[PDB]
Structures are given as C-alpha cells and as structure tokens.
Amino acid sequence: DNSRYTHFLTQHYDAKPQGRDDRYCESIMRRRGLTSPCKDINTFVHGNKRSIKAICENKNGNPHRQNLRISKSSFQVTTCKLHGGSPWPPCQYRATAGFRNVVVACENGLPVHLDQSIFRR
Template sequence: MTMGPGLLFLVFLLGLVAAPPTLAQDDSRYTKFLTQHHDAKPKGRDDRYCESMMKRRGLTSPCKDVNTFIHGNKGTIKTICGANGSPYRENLRISKSPFQVTTCKHTGGSPRPPCRYRASAGFKHVVIACENGLPVHFDESFFSL
C-alpha cells in the first residue's frame, strides 16, 4: 500500500503542528526564569530597587520570600549551562565565574502587598537548573572569595 502525495503532505503538516508546543514549553520556562531572575542593567541595587522590581515582575501576590536578580547579559547567563558552568549536586550547574547579583528578602509581616524587601548586593557564583541548554530555575548563590 502506498501513500499519495496528498496524504504525505497531511502527515508532514501534522508533524509541524505537533512540534511547536514542546519547543514553546521549553522557551516558556526560560522566559519565566528571565522574568524572575534577570535584570541586565539595574538602576540602583537598594531596598527601593527590590520593592519596585519585585512588583514590576509580578512577584508580590503573595509576597515572594526571597528572589535573586542576576545582572549580566542573557548570553553570559546561558553559558552556565555549558562552558561557564560545572555540574553541581543533582541536575544543577554552578557558574565558574561570579555574577553581579541583588538578592531581595521579604522583611516579614503580611504576605499580601504592599511588600517590603531588604536588598543585599554582591558578586556571587550562581546555581541554576538547565533544560536544552537554557537556564530554567535559579537554585541559590554563593559569595565569591
């Protein structure tokens, strides 16, 4: 039994339609990572920075306890999933070089807005999870010595 050109074309189209959701799902985890943890050029790195960034990025309903922003370009952060990262614990990568970061910690009180945050800034090695060569989860960070 042979397939005609029309049926082959239909099978080809179905294959194209089925592939993008998988790719889109991978990209959505990377996009969420960037939204929560990337800020290439911060304007100040104090408590006000944390309060405005946490609100702007949708991390204040309820108030997120701790969040770290990595200050570097996306390409450099991606390299942690490759040459600029080393295996760390189960399925994680630690950066070989430190990144400038700001960690925002909720100062307590109600978990409902308005949220108040305390900023701590420094250079740290970051630990992330990667999928398909892209960062998808921020795990923790360590001050460089």
C-alpha cells in the same frame, strides 16, 4: 514549551539594575509580578544573558549536586528579601547586592531555575 527560560528571565534577570537598594527591590518585585503573594526571597542576576546561558555548558559551568549547574564566573546579583509579618502587599524588601557564582538548572541549553538556597545568607 520554551516558556520556562522566559520565566527564568522574568524572575531572575535584570541586565542593568538601577541602584540595587531597598527601593530597587520593592519596584522590580512589583514590575515582575512577584508580589501576590509577596515572594519571601528572590535573587536577580545582572550583566548579559549570554554569560548566564553559558552556565548550561562547559564554557561557564560545572555539574552540581543532583540536578544543577554552578557557574565558573562570578555575577553581580541582588537579593530581595521579604520584611515584615505579612505575606501580602505592600511587600517591603531588604536589598542585598553581591558578587559571586550562581547555581541554576538547565533544560535544552537554557536556564530554567535559579537555586535560591545559596543566597539565604
């Protein structure tokens, strides 16, 4: 299909975040349907879509590892990390805002996966 890109946007894209504190994470993780069960860690990329899609080409990306592409430019991002002992709501999240390049996988010139490993830090 082409729904994997749409799904990437739902899970990992927020053009203009409001605050990027804990409450930001707790709200958007709900809004985007990521709390049943609670996703343990999830990162949102900010800014415009075109820069992110550009990672899929030489314009803003380099091949990376075995199935991945890494951006040349840095993005504002926010990482939401699950807090507390339970996998189930209420989902408490700690927010970590950051600014760096991102790793994705691309299909047909569109990002379809965000590599969360670089934000487990």
